[PDB]
Amino acid sequence: HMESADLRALAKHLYDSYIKSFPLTKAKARAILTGKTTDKSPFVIYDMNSLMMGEDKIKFQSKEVAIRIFQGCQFRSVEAVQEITEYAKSIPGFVNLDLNDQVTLLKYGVHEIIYTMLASLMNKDGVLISEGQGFMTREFLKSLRKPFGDFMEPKFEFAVKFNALELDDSDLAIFIAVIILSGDRPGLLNVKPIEDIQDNLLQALELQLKLNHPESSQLFAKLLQKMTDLRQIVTEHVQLLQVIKKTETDMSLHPLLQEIYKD
Amino acid sequence: HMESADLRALAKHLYDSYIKSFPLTKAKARAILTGKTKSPFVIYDMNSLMMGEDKIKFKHITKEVAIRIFQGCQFRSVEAVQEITEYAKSIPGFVNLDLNDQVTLLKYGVHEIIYTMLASLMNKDGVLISEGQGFMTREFLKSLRKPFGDFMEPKFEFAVKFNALELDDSDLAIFIAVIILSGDRPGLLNVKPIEDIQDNLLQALELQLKLNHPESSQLFAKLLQKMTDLRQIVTEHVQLLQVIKKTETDMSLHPLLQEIYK
Ligand SMILES: O=C(O)c1ccc(-c2nn(C(=O)c3c(Cl)cccc3C(F)(F)F)c3ccc(Cl)cc23)c(OCc2ccccc2)c1
Numbered sequence: 001h002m003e004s005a006d007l008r009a010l011a012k013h014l015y016d017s018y019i020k021s022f023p024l025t026k027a028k029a030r031a032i033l034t035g036k037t038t039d040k041s042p043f044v045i046y047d048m049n050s051l052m053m054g055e056d057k058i059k060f061q062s063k064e065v066a067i068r069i070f071q072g073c074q075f076r077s078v079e080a081v082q083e084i085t086e087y088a089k090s091i092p093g094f095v096n097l098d099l100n101d102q103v104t105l106l107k108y109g110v111h112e113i114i115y116t117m118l119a120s121l122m123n124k125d126g127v128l129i130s131e132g133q134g135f136m137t138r139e140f141l142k143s144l145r146k147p148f149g150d151f152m153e154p155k156f157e158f159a160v161k162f163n164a165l166e167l168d169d170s171d172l173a174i175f176i177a178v179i180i181l182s183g184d185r186p187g188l189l190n191v192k193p194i195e196d197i198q199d200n201l202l203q204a205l206e207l208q209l210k211l212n213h214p215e216s217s218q219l220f221a222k223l224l225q226k227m228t229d230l231r232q233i234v235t236e237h238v239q240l241l242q243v244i245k246k247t248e249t250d251m252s253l254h255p256l257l258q259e260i261y262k263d
Numbered sequence: 264h265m266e267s268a269d270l271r272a273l274a275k276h277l278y279d280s281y282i283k284s285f286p287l288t289k290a291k292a293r294a295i296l297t298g299k300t301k302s303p304f305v306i307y308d309m310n311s312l313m314m315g316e317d318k319i320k321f322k323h324i325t326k327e328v329a330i331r332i333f334q335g336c337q338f339r340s341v342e343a344v345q346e347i348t349e350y351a352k353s354i355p356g357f358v359n360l361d362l363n364d365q366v367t368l369l370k371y372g373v374h375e376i377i378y379t380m381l382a383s384l385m386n387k388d389g390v391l392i393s394e395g396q397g398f399m400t401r402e403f404l405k406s407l408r409k410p411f412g413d414f415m416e417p418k419f420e421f422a423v424k425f426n427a428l429e430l431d432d433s434d435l436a437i438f439i440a441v442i443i444l445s446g447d448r449p450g451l452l453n454v455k456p457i458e459d460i461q462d463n464l465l466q467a468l469e470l471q472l473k474l475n476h477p478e479s480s481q482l483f484a485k486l487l488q489k490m491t492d493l494r495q496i497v498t499e500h501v502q503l504l505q506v507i508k509k510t511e512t513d514m515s516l517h518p519l520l521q522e523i524y525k
């Protein structure tokens with residue numbers, strides 16, 4: 001049990017690190033998605049022709065479109081892992097944990113966080129890409145061939161439901177921290193100090209949601225229930241990736257991701 | 264939304280019905296398991312199973328041993344379904360829901376609730392059966408042949424972790440109600456009143472845990488996380504059943520029995 005002032009201080013700390021760690025915040029993604037701004041309008045990729053113009057317009061190849069787009073998602077997921085790793089080190093107590101457990105917490109946590117933060121970039125019609133300079137439609141992603149089309153759509157299915165909670169970045173900063181400090185990850189050596197940190201973070205989250213969303217009934221519980229789903233959604237993802245990996249030979253996985261998916 | 268007085272009234276309402284609905288409470292089960300109550304009859308191997316079904320005549324195991332015990336678990340689960348169904352009717356607002364939604368909520372909820380309440384009857388060493396008159400050891404269940412041994416042990420693995428929360432019956436009564444009133448069951452027609460009731464139940468559970476376990480930090484959060492496991496555990500359970508159905512040919516019952524257990 002912490003005191004209110006300590007819990008608000010912890011919320012403010014985590015929000016600050018989150019802003020420092022993640023280049024594209026949910027506040028900026030929503031500004032882009034809502035538009036009504038000449039300067040932040042994305043280029044929209046909705047078919048083959050617009051994808052080609054996008055590579056010349058947005059900028060920042062011998063392969064089939066579905067693979068090209070897959071490698072774009074994995075390239076960006078690897079960067080996400082790096083950004084999450086940097087954020088986690090700022091969580092008070094994280095770097096003090098047993099080093100193997102730091103690895104284990106990141107190993108089982110990054111996917112759940114990527115899904116969570118991917119929602120920030122999504123609405124029911126598509127997803128921001130290339131730091132918000134681009135927008136790729138859900139339809140175009142869903143129409144990709146073989147197993148790639150159905151591989152993309154579940155990320156959207158989760159996001160629409162998650163976005164209905166209407167969390168902002170200051171809420172997400174603590175929620176992401178709670179996910180990382182999960183004491184039930186397989187193979188953890190010292191569960192107790194991880195749970196002590198999470199209890200502080202859960203207390204921090206509970207008060208943050210009560211202050212930021214005072215009219216949102218049992219948002220804390222509903223958000224914890226979302227952390228339930230993610231576990232199975234991540235399971236379905238990893239299953240699909242392994243099946244695709246066997247069929248598709250022109251699919252490479254970044255060694256960082258390769259190691260994460262081992263057991 | 265709700266007032267403290269209303270949340271306590273709802274907690275006590277649910278506790279009273281919980282006691283009426285289920286034959287063997289957790290409080291009574293713990294007294295038996297700890298040896299602090301007539302020793303229950305112990306089934307620890309093949310021969311003691313025979314003596315118990317001849318002396319007690321356990322209604323679920325009245326063919327191969329592993330299949331006999333497997334189907335006994337189904338018989339009791341079917342009884343549990345009716346007990347949970349009757350309990351659900353005592354949840355304020357439940358009987359007023361659309362009839363199809365009551366059916367849907369019960370259909371997709373009973374598995375999670377049976378697992379939850381099975382923990383009340385279990386310790387790391389075994390499980391109470393026949394309203395506590397019997398105790399079947401974990402070791403004997405785990406050692407059953409082919410997939411049946413592997414079918415039993417996950418239930419103990421879950422139960423041991425769940426029991427570490429040290430919930431009592433007054434906590435479980437609300438928790439079970441929260442599970443039933445889940446707004447994400449496939450095919451629900453009117454989600455809004457289901458979530459409205461669950462929100463009331465969540466408030467009652469939260470206050471119940473703070474009053475009943477004032478020293479248990481974030482027990483509310485930890486218990487909601489257990490509803491994580493339950494979802495995945497039930498899915499692996501159904502996958503485990505399908506493997507048995509295809510693999511095992513000695514599972515055949517009378518077609519009427521298959522319908523009852525369908
Ligand atoms: O910016 C960001 O923060 C971001 C985080 C995630 C994705 C993204 N990953 N992804 C995956 O499948 C995936 C996940 Cl979730 C986790 C781990 C590994 C993988 C992978 F290795 F398998 F790749 C997606 C599937 C569908 C969609 Cl729509 C998005 C993702 C992301 O795509 C941006 C993007 C979209 C379209 C084209 C190019 C780039 C961005």
Ligand SMILES: O=C(O)c1ccc(-c2nn(C(=O)c3c(Cl)cccc3C(F)(F)F)c3ccc(Cl)cc23)c(OCc2ccccc2)c1
Nearest residue numbers: 332335336337339340343374377378381390392399415418
């Ligand atoms: O009294 C009670 O409250 C009770 C609730 C559950 C069981 C029990 N079910 N079970 C299942 O597999 C199962 C579950 Cl969890 C959920 C849904 C459907 C099924 C099923 F339909 F597939 F059956 C078990 C597996 C292993 C064990 Cl040890 C117990 C259970 C119960 O066994 C009593 C018993 C123990 C040993 C032999 C015979 C009977 C009692």
